[PDB]
Amino acid sequence: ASRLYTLVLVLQPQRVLLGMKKRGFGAGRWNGFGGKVQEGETIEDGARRELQEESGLTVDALHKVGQIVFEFVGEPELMDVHVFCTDSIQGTPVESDEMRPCWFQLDQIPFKDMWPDDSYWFPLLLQKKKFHGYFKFQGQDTILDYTLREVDTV
Numbered sequence: 770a771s772r773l774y775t776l777v778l779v780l781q782p783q784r785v786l787l788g789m790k791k792r793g794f795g796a797g798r799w800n801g802f803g804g805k806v807q808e809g810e811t812i813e814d815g816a817r818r819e820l821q822e823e824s825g826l827t828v829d830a831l832h833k834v835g836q837i838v839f840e841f842v843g844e845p846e847l848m849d850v851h852v853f854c855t856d857s858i859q860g861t862p863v864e865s866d867e868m869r870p871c872w873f874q875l876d877q878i879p880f881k882d883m884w885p886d887d888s889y890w891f892p893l894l895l896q897k898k899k900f901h902g903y904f905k906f907q908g909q910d911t912i913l914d915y916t917l918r919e920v921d922t923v
């Protein structure tokens with residue numbers, strides 16, 4: 770069994786929007802916007818809802834760019850993360866209780882202060898290749914196993 774999650778990256782020609790997670794699991798790291806998909810909403814609707822909750826932004830269109838599965842040792846549920854990106858946003862990003870958003874130039878992405886898996890698949894995102902990933906974590910800092918490939922259909 771896996772649990773559905775979303776991750777949204779606002780990727781513009783020279784910059785990318787990340788949020789500093791202020792509370793909860795992964796507090797203290799920059800990441801895309803996202804979270805659990807709820808009962809009664811599509812995956813893409815959940816992705817839009819999380820983006821709006823965490824940054825106030827809405828979007829005209831989201832594009833599927835990847836799927837990442839996470840195993841955490843000792844946790845029974847796999848995490849099935851559907852990754853989206855967009856270039857056209859609506860609004861100005863604002864800080865929420867959950868996230869403090871900030872734009873980063875694409876050669877200044879703060880990998881040392883992000884989830885360790887981002888170092889592996891973020892390059893493919895920036896290269897606009899679609900990908901499937903798998904990452905097995907011991908705790909929040911240590912990747913024990915991983916796979917990563919480019920795909921044709923996300």
Ligand SMILES: CCc1c(C)nc(N)nc1N1CCOCC1
Nearest residue numbers: 774775776803804839850884886
């Ligand atoms: C904690 C799972 C996780 C890992 C390991 N890495 C990244 N980059 N994002 C993660 N999430 C994606 C969005 O849902 C919340 C958590």
